[PDB]
């Protein structure tokens, strides 16, 4: 009884904050043309992806979890499982894209000016969305309803992303772990480590350095439980579902959803520039 009460409270708290925190960024960045810059085009795409992540994950992964049945249809299960995957991909790739531009600006500034432009920024955003959509297209196809019968002889549904055989399933989750988690894991680490090394070699200097460390660590913290759980259930889903399924995996998936609620905080609301414009856009 205690556990569902602290589940709904935490889920709603991340929800209404993410919803409010992403619509404000989209409003300010679209309306204010002067504010728009190379990095703001990246932040705007990140805000849209986080808002897409919030709307198609949180209510669709909590109400079926509380009621223990998928109350929506099969077409809802397919359409939403595609937008969840796509939004995760765009969010993670925008963070890597911001880090690569940041590395170019600091380590090799003169060379960067020839290529790092606003037109170049739009091309990377266009490539990010078009590649994320293409790679997440197996999600609607392989996710369909699976029915079960309860103790009361009722009918119920489960929306599950299940491949035809476990030989493709283990290779899928291994592929997904590398490109989504592991490759940003060390690319963002080397990019923000060289920037931190070039700035360390006065109290504002040490400010920027430690915030780069918070970006990579909270990237790890948000995505490590769910990606490990996906790797766990790929090779043996009997031990993973016996321990984690139900209330623990709700908290695991919520910590994962928290990334789309802390990304506007650590990228926009901690900016001196963006807060001055946020007070100007709204009366």
């Amino acid at each position: 009884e205690w556990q569902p009460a602290v589940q709904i409270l935490l889920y709603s708290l991340i929800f209404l904050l993410s919803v409010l925190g992403n619509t404000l960024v989209i409003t300010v960045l679209i309306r204010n043309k002067r504010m728009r810059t190379v990095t703001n085009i990246f932040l705007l795409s990140l805000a849209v992806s986080d808002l897409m992540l919030c709307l198609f994950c949180m209510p669709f992964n909590l109400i079926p979890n509380l009621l223990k049945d998928f109350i929506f249809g099969s077409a809802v299960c397919k359409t939403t499982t595609y937008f969840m995957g796509t939004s995760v991909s765009v969010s993670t790739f925008n963070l890597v894209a911001i880090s690569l531009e940041r590395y170019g600006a600091i380590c090799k500034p003169l060379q960067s000016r020839v290529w790092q432009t606003k037109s170049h920024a739009l091309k990377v955003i266009a490539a990010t969305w078009c590649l994320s959509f293409t790679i997440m297209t197996p999600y609607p196809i392989y996710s369909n309803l699976v029915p079960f019968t309860k103790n009361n002889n009722q009918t119920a549904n489960m929306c599950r992303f299940l491949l035809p055989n476990d030989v493709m399933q283990q290779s899928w989750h291994t592929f997904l772990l590398l490109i989504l988690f592991l490759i940003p894991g060390i690319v963002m680490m080397v990019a923000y480590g060289l920037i931190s090394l070039e700035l360390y070699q006065l109290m504002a200097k040490k400010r920027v350095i430690r915030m780069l460390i918070v970006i990579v660590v909270l990237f790890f913290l948000c995505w490590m439980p769910i990606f490990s759980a996906n790797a766990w259930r790929a090779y043996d889903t009997a031990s993973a579902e016996r321990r984690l399924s139900g209330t623990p995996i709700s908290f695991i998936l919520l910590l994962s959803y928290t990334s789309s609620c802390v990304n506007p905080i650590i990228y926009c609301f901690m900016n001196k520039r963006f807060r001055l414009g946020f007070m100007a856009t709204f009366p």
Partner: peptide
Amino acid sequence: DYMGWMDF
């Protein structure tokens, strides 16, 4: 029973 979770 309700055993499992969505990937994302």
